[PDB]
Amino acid sequence: TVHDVIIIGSGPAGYTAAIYAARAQLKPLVFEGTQFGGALMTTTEVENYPGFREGITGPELMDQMREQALRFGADLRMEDVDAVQLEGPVKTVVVGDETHQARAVILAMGAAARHLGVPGEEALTGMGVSTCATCDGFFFRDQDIVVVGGGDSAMEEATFLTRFARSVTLIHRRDEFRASKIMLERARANEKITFLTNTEITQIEGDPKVTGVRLRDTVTGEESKLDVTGVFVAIGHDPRSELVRGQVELDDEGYVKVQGRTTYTSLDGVFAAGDLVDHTYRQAITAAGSGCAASIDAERWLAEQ
Amino acid sequence: TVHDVIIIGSGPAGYTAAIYAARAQLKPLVFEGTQFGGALMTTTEVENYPGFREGITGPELMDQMREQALRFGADLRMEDVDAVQLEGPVKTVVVGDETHQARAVILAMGAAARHLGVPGEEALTGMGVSTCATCDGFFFRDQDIVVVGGGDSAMEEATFLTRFARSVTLIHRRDEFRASKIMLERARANEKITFLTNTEITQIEGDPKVTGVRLRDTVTGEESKLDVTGVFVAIGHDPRSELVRGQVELDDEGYVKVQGRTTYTSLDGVFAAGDLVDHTYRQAITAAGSGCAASIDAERWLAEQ
Ligand SMILES: Cc1cc2nc3c(=O)[nH]c(=O)nc-3n(C[C@H](O)[C@H](O)[C@H](O)COP(=O)(O)OP(=O)(O)OC[C@H]3O[C@@H](n4cnc5c(N)ncnc54)[C@H](O)[C@@H]3O)c2cc1C
Ligand SMILES: Cc1cc2nc3c(=O)[nH]c(=O)nc-3n(C[C@H](O)[C@H](O)[C@H](O)COP(=O)(O)OP(=O)(O)OC[C@H]3O[C@@H](n4cnc5c(N)ncnc54)[C@H](O)[C@@H]3O)c2cc1C
Ligand SMILES: Nc1ccc(Nc2ccc3c(N)nsc3c2)cc1
Ligand SMILES: Nc1ccc(Nc2ccc3c(N)nsc3c2)cc1
Ligand SMILES: [Cl-]
Ligand SMILES: [Cl-]
Ligand SMILES: [Cl-]
Ligand SMILES: [Cl-]
Ligand SMILES: [Mg+2]
Ligand SMILES: [Mg+2]
Numbered sequence: 001t002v003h004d005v006i007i008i009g010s011g012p013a014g015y016t017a018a019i020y021a022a023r024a025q026l027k028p029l030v031f032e033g034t035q036f037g038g039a040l041m042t043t044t045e046v047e048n049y050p051g052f053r054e055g056i057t058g059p060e061l062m063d064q065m066r067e068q069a070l071r072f073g074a075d076l077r078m079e080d081v082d083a084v085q086l087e088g089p090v091k092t093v094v095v096g097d098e099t100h101q102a103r104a105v106i107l108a109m110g111a112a113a114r115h116l117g118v119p120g121e122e123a124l125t126g127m128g129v130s131t132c133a134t135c136d137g138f139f140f141r142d143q144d145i146v147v148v149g150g151g152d153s154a155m156e157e158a159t160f161l162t163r164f165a166r167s168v169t170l171i172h173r174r175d176e177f178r179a180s181k182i183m184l185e186r187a188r189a190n191e192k193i194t195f196l197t198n199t200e201i202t203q204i205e206g207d208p209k210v211t212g213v214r215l216r217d218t219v220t221g222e223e224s225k226l227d228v229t230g231v232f233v234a235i236g237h238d239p240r241s242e243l244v245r246g247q248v249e250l251d252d253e254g255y256v257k258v259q260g261r262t263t264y265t266s267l268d269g270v271f272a273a274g275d276l277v278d279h280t281y282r283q284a285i286t287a288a289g290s291g292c293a294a295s296i297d298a299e300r301w302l303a304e305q
Numbered sequence: 306t307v308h309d310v311i312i313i314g315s316g317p318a319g320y321t322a323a324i325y326a327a328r329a330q331l332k333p334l335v336f337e338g339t340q341f342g343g344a345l346m347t348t349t350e351v352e353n354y355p356g357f358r359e360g361i362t363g364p365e366l367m368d369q370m371r372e373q374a375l376r377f378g379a380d381l382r383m384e385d386v387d388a389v390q391l392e393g394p395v396k397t398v399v400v401g402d403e404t405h406q407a408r409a410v411i412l413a414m415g416a417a418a419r420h421l422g423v424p425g426e427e428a429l430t431g432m433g434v435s436t437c438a439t440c441d442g443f444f445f446r447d448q449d450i451v452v453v454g455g456g457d458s459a460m461e462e463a464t465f466l467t468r469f470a471r472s473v474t475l476i477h478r479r480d481e482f483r484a485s486k487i488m489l490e491r492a493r494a495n496e497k498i499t500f501l502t503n504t505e506i507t508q509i510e511g512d513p514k515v516t517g518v519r520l521r522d523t524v525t526g527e528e529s530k531l532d533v534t535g536v537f538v539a540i541g542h543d544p545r546s547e548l549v550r551g552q553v554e555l556d557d558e559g560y561v562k563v564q565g566r567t568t569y570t571s572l573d574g575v576f577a578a579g580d581l582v583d584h585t586y587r588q589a590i591t592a593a594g595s596g597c598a599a600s601i602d603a604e605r606w607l608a609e610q
């Protein structure tokens with residue numbers, strides 16, 4: 001049984017691809033993962049996804065998307081793809097001890113935001129701990145917050161956040177910065193930003209919400225506590241391209257490369273969408289847009305065979 | 306008074322750009338047009354926009370988007386931009402006898418679908434007359450329908466529609482086809498497609514919904530009537546780039562060109578999104594995704610000044 005298309009991933013890119021493929025009568029087979037629903041399934045509020053004048057929670061939005069895909073006939077499986085064979089006319093995905101095949105595959109595995117890995121980070125996620133200044137900076141008006149990281153991401157998040165926050169403490173575990181000189185220099189010039197180098201967070205305090213961070217000097221071991229009400233983690237992303245490394249061309253940071261303004265990868269019959277590809281915007285609406293494009297690409301490519 | 310950003314257009318690209326720019330505290334000034342709300346403001350059902358398990362009407366979706374932009378502080382004006390000056394640090398838009406200025410401009414004027422221009426076309430829009438096989442082909446299962454046009458668009462729409470329709474009559478006013486040989490040959494091979502060359506539609510019949518089309522031979526003048534329940538107009542699109550021709554680089558069909566996978570045009574401080582740029586996907590979700598990207602591009606570009 002060779003399916004027309006298999007989709008790997010269940011964030012906005014994967015579900016939008018599933019909606020379009022199903023409505024196109026391709027009977028898409030979608031492997032959602034056991035941690036299904038993408039990055040929004042673990043935020044509280046989504047206010048910048050167009051179409052919801054008063055907002056919607058991340059889980060509510062993903063459940064709409066999932067039920068929408070189901071309504072048009074997508075075959076959804078809450079299982080992880082463990083391995084793929086993507087070269088040639090018939091592609092194979094392996095799911096535990098089960099195999100499935102398809103003429104086209106849409107890769108929508110997303111990117112993992114790096115975690116601090118400290119107590120309180122999970123408990124206080126959406127309650128003061130954020131990954132997304134664009135999304136959440138709004139909510140920290142006149143507040144004292146931290147940003148963690150040493151690259152252009154952290155510099156961009158920190159300087160952006162000063163238009164809301166009373167103060168931004170930028171914390172980095174080294175005394176050297178991997179961020180570009182321009183981004184570094186913009187952060188230095190901003191009077192609302194204080195730099196804390198050679199510093200790591202060991203714990204995030206907060207009873208319902210973030211009240212502070214515990215700090216350790218990575219050189220001397222000196223520990224202290226900072227009172228803050230927000231923690232923005234900006235230590236980088238890891239695109240989830242492990243399944244396809246060695247089969248589909250990746251850039252030096254592991255993002256799947258695509259041709260021009262399409263979703264076509266280096267492999268015939270293989271398309272890629274969402275934050276697996278995009279290291280620039282990383283929003284739900286852009287991932288959904290690219291998931292649509294992947295399905296239209298796949299449909300048109302299938303019609304050429 | 307020089308604004309940070311002006312947005313021209315009020316479809317999904319323009320409203321999503323407005324939402325992001327407003328949430329970024331850029332106080333975007335948005336000229337919606339008198340025919341505001343984009344292409345969806347004149348369809349009935351939008352079923353493939355992810356986030357609505359049971360669908361939503363086009364006007365309901367656009368009103369959500371508009372109120373969402375308002376909620377975050379967008380300044381919305383239901384007026385047409387009549388002329389622009391986009392070169393240099395301060396850009397000007399002219400609206401009747403009023404002028405407005407901004408450091409960045411986001412172009413989101415969309416593309417106009419060409420119309421047959423015959424009686425019944427407007428009355429029966431969304432009631433049998435469609436512009437979008439992806440969107441509406443679903444609803445014509447086992448029905449006899451027409452597709453109008455002579456290019457790759459019409460060939461693609463007609464062959465796609467045969468997976469739903471009982472029959473597809475492809476009508477073209479010439480006996481020569483501007484579509485590529487592959488697209489032409491695929492349509493010829495499909496047993497559900499009948500070709501009617503040298504034929505124009507003079508009227509679309511239908512009491513609540515499409516019941517037939519009146520036809521004229523463009524050579525002999527012979528007229529007849531075809532019983533059909535759907536009419537898909539696929540005679541091409543005109544991107545709304547007239548305002549910016551001679552200022553921003555356009556491709557040979559008039560679409561605004563953008564740099565790589567960004568929204569940057571050939572002019573510093575000018576960004577473009579939606580169907581003004583995209584001649585491939587032309588969906589609401591993709592236009593919304595690109596409107597987000599234009600605002601993020603614009604925000605980051607503004608921060609560099
Ligand atoms: C805390 C947080 C809050 C956010 N808030 C917002 C917001 O308010 N607005 C906004 O626009 N964006 C927000 N974002 C960003 C947005 O969620 C992402 O940009 C978007 O979800 C990317 O979608 P994607 O489909 O490419 O990947 P993801 O959302 O990462 O989805 C990929 C999914 O596929 C699954 N998958 C991966 N590999 C496999 C495999 N091998 N087999 C099976 N399944 C697999 C994953 O487990 C995951 O469930 C937020 C992100 C985070 C982390
Ligand atoms: C009948 C119909 C049904 C459709 N159904 C679907 C569907 O179900 N699903 C789907 O995904 N897509 C659908 N589409 C396509 C979708 O609507 C478009 O792809 C999308 O709206 C493009 O958005 P855009 O913002 O780029 O431009 P548009 O939607 O064209 O919006 C541009 C807006 O800006 C305004 N504007 C233009 N020039 C100026 C100016 N100089 N000054 C001020 N304002 C100006 C225009 O009047 C218009 O209101 C449909 C299209 C049509 C025509
Ligand atoms: N995958 C991955 C790679 C690198 C990191 N860096 C990191 C981790 C924890 C902390 C911390 N508590 N303060 S600064 C910091 C930085 C995290 C995850
Ligand atoms: N802008 C623009 C340019 C070209 C067209 N072509 C056209 C118009 C009407 C009809 C018809 N009634 N049957 S075939 C056809 C084709 C329409 C609009
Ligand atoms: Cl390789
Ligand atoms: Cl290998
Ligand atoms: Cl020019
Ligand atoms: Cl000129
Ligand atoms: Mg995983
Ligand atoms: Mg996830």
Ligand SMILES: [Mg+2]
Pocket residue numbers: 338545
């Ligand atoms: Mg107009």
Ligand SMILES: [Mg+2]
Pocket residue numbers: 340341342343344345346
């Ligand atoms: Mg319109």
